[PDB]
Every structure is written in structure tokens, then in C-alpha cells.
Amino acid sequence: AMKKVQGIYRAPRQHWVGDGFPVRSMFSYQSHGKQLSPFLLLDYAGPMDFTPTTQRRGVGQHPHRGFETVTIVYHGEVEHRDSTGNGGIIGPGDVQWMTAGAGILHEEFHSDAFAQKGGPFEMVQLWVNLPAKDKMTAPGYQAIRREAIPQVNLPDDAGNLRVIAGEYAGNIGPAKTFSPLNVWDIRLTQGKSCEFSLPAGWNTALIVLHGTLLVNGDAIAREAEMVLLDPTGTHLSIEANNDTVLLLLSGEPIDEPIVGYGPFVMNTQAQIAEAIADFNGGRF
């Protein structure tokens, strides 16, 4: 039962989010919500080399409600601060899994050490929706160190797979999840292939960061391109026509309505108009 390729998408125009994040936006819920549940958004920042500066490049403080933001750093360093009294820097290999939930107020920027030295900068920020019963859950954070994320070798010297969230071959990703899903960081060596089995009905997407991937023997994906698969199927194949770096996102759909606006993604317009009212008063 092959997870058919249902769509493949060319690389978007890169655009600036603040002054620290040059992102190519892979998908957004308003057109991909039903298709990609539980995932809501994926920004691919960089790769871009920054020079030394005294500036603090990044994004200003802004609210979030009703979902989770995941930062996956490949190069560079980002400090995050949230109103839950929390903070910290996330570096190469590190992951942060922030639950905004009932409401959070965060800014993210280049760490002071990265500002001083500069260098290559590359990361992925992913939005993960919450079940309706947890939309007003308490905001929290998980700082996950590179050393805490499994790194399995694929068979036949095909490359690596890092389980950020979910499970693969008995390795449970360190990221806690309200909903069944996988977030996999895959490195694949040229001329090697691997097959995967995934749950039936799980919405699945592949995103190539580097290299040239052959998907299901049918679709060729390249840098900053997205593969959207048939959820009904159960298995999957990838071959790297070039040394590839990709993300595999899968997950059990959340069969609940999505009503979102900007930084608020809720279930009802009344909850959206409610969030816009809570933020303009100062509840956040």
C-alpha cells in the first residue's frame, strides 16, 4: 500500500521575517490545513551567512495561541525568550518545542555569540496544531540538546535518521507530543535508497533541504521543494540521486475545524475574535 505522491511544489521566493530570518515558506494551513494536519506551517530559514554585527537581528515580541512552534537549528544560534519566565539558546542540532497553548508572548533572535562572530545560519520552524481540548493548555517549553536526539543509521550505509518526535525502529524522539506524529531529520547518501512504513491515514510530507531525492520511484524533489503524499497508504520509498538532507513529517490528523488569523490559530472565529481581544488588553 504505497503512500502515493499527491502533490509536489516548487521552491518559493525567499522573504524576510524580521531582520534575522530569511525564510522560504513551504506551506501554510489556510491552503494546507486539512492536507497537512497536525502540521500548520513550515518556514525554512537560510542557509545564509551573516557577518559580525552589534545588531540583535531577529523578530520582535509577538503573541501565540493554540498551537506549538518547533525550532530545528542546523547552523547558527538562536536565543528565545518567552513570557512563561523562560529562555535559552538553541544551537546546531538543538531543537526547541514550545507549546504556546492558552497564550504566550515570545521573541527570538540571533544569540549574542552568533552576532559577534557571524557565520552560516540555517534552520526550520514548524507549527504543530493542538487538539481542541488542549487549545487553552498551559504554555511550556522543551529545550532538546543535539546529544539527546536519537541518530539511527539507515541500513546499507544509506545515511542517518534523527527522530526529533515520534518513533523509528525502536527509537523514541525526545519531543513530547499531544498527538501521534513523527518529525524525522534524514540524511541520505547519493546512490542509496530506503523504504519506510507509516501509519495508515497519517498525513505525510517530505521536504528536501539539500540534494536531489527520488520519491516513490515517481517524483524528483530538489532543494527547498515539498512532497505531499497520499495519507491513506502505509509505505514509502526514497532514493538520493545526490547527497540529500530532508525532513519527514507525518502524523495522525486532527479532524477538527481550523480557524486562524496571524499568530492565533483556534477552532472558532469567536475564539479568534476572543484572542484578538485578550492581546489588545494585556492578558497575554
| Residues whose CB falls within 8 Å of the CB of residue 104, separated by 6 or more in sequence, listed in order | 63, 64, 65, 82, 83, 84, 98, 139, 284
How far, in whole angstroms, is CA 153 from its chain's centroid?
A: 22
CA gyration radius, the chain: 18
What residue numbers does the annotated binding site for Fe cation cover? 62, 64, 106, 108
Report the binding-site residues for Fe(3+).
Answer: 62, 106, 108
First to last CA, the chain: 46
207 Cβ neighbours under 8 A, 6+ residues apart: 26, 42, 44, 225, 226, 227, 246, 247, 249
3-state SS class at 188 = strand
Binding residues: 62, 64, 106, 108
Q: Which residues carry a binding-site annotation for Mg(2+)? A: 62, 64, 106
- Residue 151, by phi and psi: left (phi above 0), alpha (psi -120 to 50) or beta? beta
